[PDB]
Amino acid sequence: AVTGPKIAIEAIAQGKNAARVIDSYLRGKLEPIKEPYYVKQEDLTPEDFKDRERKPRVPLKVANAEERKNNFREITSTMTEKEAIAEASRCLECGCMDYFECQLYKYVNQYDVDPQR
Amino acid sequence: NLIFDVSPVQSNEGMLCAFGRFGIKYVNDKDRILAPLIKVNGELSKTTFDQALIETAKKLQAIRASYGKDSIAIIASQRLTNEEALLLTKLAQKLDTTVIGSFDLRESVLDRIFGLNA
Ligand code: SF4
């Protein structure tokens, strides 16, 4: 109703942010949504990951076109537990392991830093 | 969950025939189907009630869409209760078809003479 036709996760994000702002407003302290500052690595290129073992992605089971075009049954299937664990084990763990306890992140989010200069 | 006997009531001649007395044997039949079947890979296979009903609704709606009004026939056994027959008529009304009848239904002449086929 506000952004026009988008994907559903954008609508969910809008609903969650609006819920946050409405909860603040119901307390008399209407606060806009503040975007946190995150340290990122924009310089990473494929040769930085050239030593990792290559592992295949979990295959997606798709129903046969001839049979599926005649019915309204689900086209794709949910993966199995073995495939789920094997696929989750492929993650490279890009995020910082200290994110939930790092004091530097907390302090740089308490003070409006402009570190690009 | 098994039927063991049938007795006539003591009302008028207190009688049943072969059907009413002995044809209740189909209730205990082991060949009764208890789960729905839908055609996968061209053969009927067991499924759940929700999936089968959704498939039925989609098949009937597709026929009605691609062929129009009065393209689905609802042929019902005359052993169903009055409520099931009425609900089937309402289903034909929602399916946009007036073709609801029975293959055991005799041609009617009393409604043309007296008004009601009764
Ligand atoms: S943390 Fe895992 S899922 Fe997220 S970008 Fe890195 S490899 Fe992909």
Taking a C-beta distance cutoff of 8 angstroms, is the pair A54, A19 a contact?
Answer: no
Q: Is B98 helix (H, G, I), strand (E, B) or coil?
A: coil
Taking contacts as CB-CB distances below 8 angstroms, the residues of chain B near A67 are: 40-41
Alpha carbon dihedral B65, B69, B73, B76, in 10-degree steps, equals 110
Distance in angstroms (rounded) separating the CA atoms of residues B86 and A41: 69
Taking a C-beta distance cutoff of 8 angstroms, is the pair B74, B91 a contact?
Answer: yes
A6 labeled part of a ligand binding site = yes
A8 labeled part of a ligand binding site = yes
Convert A52-91 to b/e letters by CB count within 10 Å (16 or more is b): eeeeeeeeeeeeeeeeeeebeeeeeeeeeeeeeeeeeeee
Find out whether the beta carbon of A88 lies less than 6 Å from any atom of ligand 1.
no
Instruction: List helix spans (H) across chain B.
Output: 18-22, 49-67, 82-94, 110-113
Taking contacts as CB-CB distances below 8 angstroms, the residues of chain B near A73 are: 51, 55
User: By C-alpha distance, which of B94, B98, B102, B100 is closest to B61?
Assistant: B94
Tell me how far the alpha carbon of residue A62 lies from the centroid of ligand 1, in angstroms.
25
Taking contacts as CB-CB distances below 8 angstroms, the residues of chain B near A77 are: none
Taking a C-beta distance cutoff of 8 angstroms, is the pair B100, B92 a contact?
Answer: yes
User: By C-alpha distance, which of A79, A41, A82, A73 is closest to B58?
Assistant: A73
Residues from A in contact with B at Cβ < 8 Å: 67, 71-73
Tokens 């306890």 correspond to A101
Q: Is B38 helix (H, G, I), strand (E, B) or coil?
A: strand
Find out whether the beta carbon of A92 lies less than 6 Å from any atom of ligand 1.
yes
Q: Beta strands B100-101 and B74-75: pairing type? A: parallel
Q: Inter-chain contact A71–B58, Cβ cutoff 8 Å?
A: yes
Q: Count CB neighbours of B97 within 10 A.
A: 19
Q: Beta strands B43-46 and B100-101: pairing type? A: unpaired
Tokens 């954008």 correspond to A10
Alpha carbon of B73: minimum distance to chain A alpha carbons (Å): 21
